[PDB]
Amino acid sequence: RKDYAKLANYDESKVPQYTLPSVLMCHDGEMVQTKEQWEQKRRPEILNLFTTYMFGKAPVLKHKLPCTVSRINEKALNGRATRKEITIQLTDDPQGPHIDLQLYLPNHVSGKIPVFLGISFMPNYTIYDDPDLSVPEITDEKMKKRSFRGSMDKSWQLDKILEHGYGLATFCYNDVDPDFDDDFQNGVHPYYYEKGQNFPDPDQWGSIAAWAWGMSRAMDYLETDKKVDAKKVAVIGHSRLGKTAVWAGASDPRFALVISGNSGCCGVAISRRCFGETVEAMNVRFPHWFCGNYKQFNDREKYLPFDQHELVALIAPRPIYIASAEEDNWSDQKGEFLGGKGAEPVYALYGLGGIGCEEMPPVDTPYMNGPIAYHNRKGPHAVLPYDWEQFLRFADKYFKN
Ligand code: NA
After folding, report:
1. For 324, which of 70, 328, 376, 381 could close a Cys bridge (C-beta 3.0–4.6 Å)?
2. Cα–Cα distance between 339 and 271 in angstroms, integer?
3. Which of these is catalytic: 120, 155, 239, 251?
4. How many angstroms separate the alpha carbon of residue 276 from the centre of ligand 1?
């Protein structure tokens, strides 16, 4: 019902007073001052609070899901790449939902290959204009195409990625759970209900948590593929899928590097600023996104047990790239910058520096010599070739020698 877009505040001066919850102080009040105390005592407290109160618990599995490598082309893209389709069975029902993962690896590169794991709004054929993914429309019985081959090429830059000697793997988020407020009708959630349960408990996963769990299932296959380097898998997504990729990085330490693509409100942006999008605008307009518990903080940011700098802190010591867009005031770009700045004291526990500047930098001015990178670039809320340029130059610092 309510608007929210026109009620929002975009005026830095009308931003309220606030105090950031202290990331280094435990629940019992003892301050952390060593990485040991962070890993042993404080980090699990913060992981617990984000799992309990905003993203929701996700199933732990006795064993890996079944998958099959259902298609391979070692001469894909005129011999430039090997293309693999991997279907991952998400539930115990083989006619239930599956992740249809699409992996591209460069040919002519010897070792195990670093890979960017991404999650997309649309099906796999939009990632690249791949001409041998082609059967005519008049004979096609498969799902009717809503976009076109390679429509999202500007958001994925496969050519840039292969050129750095890296791979790209992606799946569409609707494989795991449709982005509709439908009580998870056609998603994975009901397959993991107990017999006396007909919707997730208030502390159990919503959609973002399920989509993140999906990336983790894709990593379960990737780490068994002899050509990919299981030590150098990055995660990336944009907007709601940026919120997802940050959570997947936070709750799955296997991932080597995290890319926040305009993750904004309830991503890396500090909620207490109440700038642009707000917790309540979020939960009211997308109630399936977060767990039941999170709705208690509608218009009540003062009472969050945490704020989003502590989410970023879950990444440390691993690197994270925070990307803002100049026109995307809805994401609160300064707030996104401050989400990274608030995490600096944890990274210092590992003897690492910070972003590299004290106040928010001007547009088109990246900082990436520290463990947390930041840019706010010209133009619109999206992931553009400009963003991939910075992403890949940051990744080279960690994956190349
Ligand atoms: Na905000």
Report:
1. 376
2. 9
3. 239
4. 5
